[PDB]
Amino acid sequence: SVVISDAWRQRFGGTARLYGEKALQLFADAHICVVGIGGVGSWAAEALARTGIGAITLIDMDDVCVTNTNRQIHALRDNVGLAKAEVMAERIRQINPECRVTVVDDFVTPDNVAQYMSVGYSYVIDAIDSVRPKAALIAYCRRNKIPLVTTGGAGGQIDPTQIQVTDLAKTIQDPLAAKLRERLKSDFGVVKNSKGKLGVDCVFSTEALVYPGFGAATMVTATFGFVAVSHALKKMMAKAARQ
Amino acid sequence: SVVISDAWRQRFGGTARLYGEKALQLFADAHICVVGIGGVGSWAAEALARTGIGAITLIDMDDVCVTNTNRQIHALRDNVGLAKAEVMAERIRQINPECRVTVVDDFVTPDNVAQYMSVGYSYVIDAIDSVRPKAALIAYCRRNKIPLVTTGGAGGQIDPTQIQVTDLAKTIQDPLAAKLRERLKSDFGVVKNSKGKLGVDCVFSTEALVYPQSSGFGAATMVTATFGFVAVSHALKKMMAKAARQ
Numbered sequence: 001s002v003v004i005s006d007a008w009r010q011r012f013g014g015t016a017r018l019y020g021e022k023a024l025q026l027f028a029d030a031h032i033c034v035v036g037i038g039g040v041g042s043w044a045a046e047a048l049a050r051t052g053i054g055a056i057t058l059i060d061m062d063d064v065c066v067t068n069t070n071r072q073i074h075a076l077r078d079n080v081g082l083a084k085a086e087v088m089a090e091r092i093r094q095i096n097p098e099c100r101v102t103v104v105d106d107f108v109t110p111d112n113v114a115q116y117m118s119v120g121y122s123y124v125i126d127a128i129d130s131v132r133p134k135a136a137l138i139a140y141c142r143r144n145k146i147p148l149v150t151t152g153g154a155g156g157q158i159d160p161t162q163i164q165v166t167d168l169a170k171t172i173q174d175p176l177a178a179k180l181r182e183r184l185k186s187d188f189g190v191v192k193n194s195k196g197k198l199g200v201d202c203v204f205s206t207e208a209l210v211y212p213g214f215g216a217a218t219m220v221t222a223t224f225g226f227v228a229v230s231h232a233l234k235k236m237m238a239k240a241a242r243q
Numbered sequence: 244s245v246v247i248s249d250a251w252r253q254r255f256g257g258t259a260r261l262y263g264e265k266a267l268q269l270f271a272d273a274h275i276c277v278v279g280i281g282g283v284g285s286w287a288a289e290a291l292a293r294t295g296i297g298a299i300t301l302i303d304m305d306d307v308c309v310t311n312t313n314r315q316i317h318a319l320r321d322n323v324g325l326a327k328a329e330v331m332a333e334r335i336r337q338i339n340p341e342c343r344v345t346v347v348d349d350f351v352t353p354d355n356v357a358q359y360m361s362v363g364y365s366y367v368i369d370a371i372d373s374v375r376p377k378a379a380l381i382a383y384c385r386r387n388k389i390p391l392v393t394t395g396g397a398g399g400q401i402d403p404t405q406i407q408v409t410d411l412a413k414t415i416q417d418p419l420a421a422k423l424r425e426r427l428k429s430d431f432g433v434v435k436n437s438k439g440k441l442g443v444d445c446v447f448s449t450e451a452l453v454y455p456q457s458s459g460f461g462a463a464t465m466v467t468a469t470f471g472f473v474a475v476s477h478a479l480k481k482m483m484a485k486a487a488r489q
């Protein structure tokens with residue numbers, strides 16, 4: 001459904017060499033949504049674009065702030081005060097002019113989550129920090145079998161080598177992930193499996209949290225983003241191989 | 244000491260909250276050199292800037308090519324055909340206008356390495372791909388006790404969770420590192436000591452290589468950038484430890 005141009009092949013030849021032609025087409029035909037374009041999600045957006053994903057949706061309504069500078073790819077002096085999602089969309093268009101980027105200038109809420117998630121995404125990357133919306137987002141994708149990867153807390157951590165993906169039920173050292181399980185259970189009835197799983201893939205770190213509200217670093221928060229994207233692409237490729 | 248301005252505190256207050264106030268100033272006073280502004284070094288540079296490093300030198304003479312798009316932070320439509328180091332420098336100035344950024348529009352060679360490393364860097368991040376000059380750079384820094392972190396090959400890899408740090412003698416699934424060791428031996432007589440170590444810290448991955456599909460190894464942002472990020476984290480950690488020891 002995207003006809004790969006010669007220019008696209010120039011941009012993404014390295015992607016073809018790594019994942020294969022079938023994968024290159026799969027990515028070019030994919031539509032991935034990132035919700036929250038902050039210290040995790042902005043790097044996830046970047047990585048999507050640089051891996052030949054053919055359509056990307058970004059959901060956020062916040063502006064670039066100078067305090068974002070330590071950990072968000074869109075935080076540059078001339079961007080300050082502009083909407084994070086539009087700034088990122090403009091950058092994606094510079095990475096891959098043929099990528100179809102949509103900006104939703106809104107916050108996902110429990111009342112609008114169904115209408116936004118129901119578009120038909122290949123994958124959803126959840127990089128929101130507010131717990132009530134995040135729980136609602138995860139609950140919705142999970143019930144509807146919308147492929148999702150969610151991300152735990154990326155602040156207060158210095159070691160990018162401790163980042164990994166596991167079922168949301170098995171995360172450790174992560175109070176955000178913990179409070180999410182709580183909310184899922186009580187407000188959406190989401191609960192453990194036969195196997196002790198919630199069936200929700202989560203990027204988290206095993207690192208014990210560093211208290212000074214938390215600080216953050218690019219090397220860690222970006223790696224959350226990148227690990228979420230690589231997890232998604234792996235799943236998508238495994239699915240495409242199966243059928 | 245570099246004076247930390249109120250604007251600096253606005254940009255990097257998150258850094259101070261994570262690493263502490265002493266570290267904020269250590270980073271502001273630091274001068275770190277990145278050699279090779281590509282799949283790994285471009286993201287190393289980005290990360291140094293966003294962590295409040297006060298001086299950064301960038302060494303490369305290559306230009307931004309459209310084929311860099313899959314894995315280099317400076318590869319955008321408008322930059323194609325410009326010098327990588329200059330493009331990256333301009334971006335660092337947008338991240339932190341008070342960072343002092345030096346561009347060396349050249350390649351490191353066995354004949355210029357001493358002059359370029361004679362500067363007194365806090366740290367050197369070696370992200371070059373060419374094995375002969377890579378050996379020359381590493382051998383120079385090692386002999387001179389210049390703090391350095393190198394990396395092996397970042398291509399042919401899809402899993403950013405397998406990246407970690409070991410001594411250069413101990414890397415696996417990394418033809419580049421292997422050649423590098425051969426060249427260190429053959430050209431600088433640098434060889435393993437009694438404990439099996441070269442005394443060179445190297446970012447590598449345990450991942451089995453993914454060979455060319457569809458003309459050398461491919462690469463992805465998610466992995467090559469994480470190489471650079473793990474290099475920066477390692478360097479900052481070592482710098483903080485040496486400061487505390489002192």
Ligand SMILES: Nc1ncnc2c1ncn2[C@@H]1O[C@H](COP(=O)(O)OP(=O)(O)OP(=O)(O)O)[C@@H](O)[C@H]1O
Nearest residue numbers: 035036037038039059060062107108128129130133
């Ligand atoms: N319900 C929501 N829908 C979409 N995006 C959201 C929602 N809630 C939060 N976000 C966004 O998620 C991102 C979270 O990013 P991150 O945690 O790094 O921190 P930030 O909010 O930019 O920083 P700070 O904590 O300093 O305000 C932000 O860009 C934020 O605007």
Ligand SMILES: Nc1ncnc2c1ncn2[C@@H]1O[C@H](COP(=O)(O)OP(=O)(O)OP(=O)(O)O)[C@@H](O)[C@H]1O
Nearest residue numbers: 279280281282302303305350351370371372373376
């Ligand atoms: N002797 C050297 N000194 C400084 N930089 C170097 C040296 N040799 C190579 N480099 C730089 O190291 C970086 C390596 O990056 P990377 O391996 O991603 O390759 P690239 O050269 O942009 O890719 P390709 O040439 O395969 O398209 C490049 O920007 C390159 O110009």
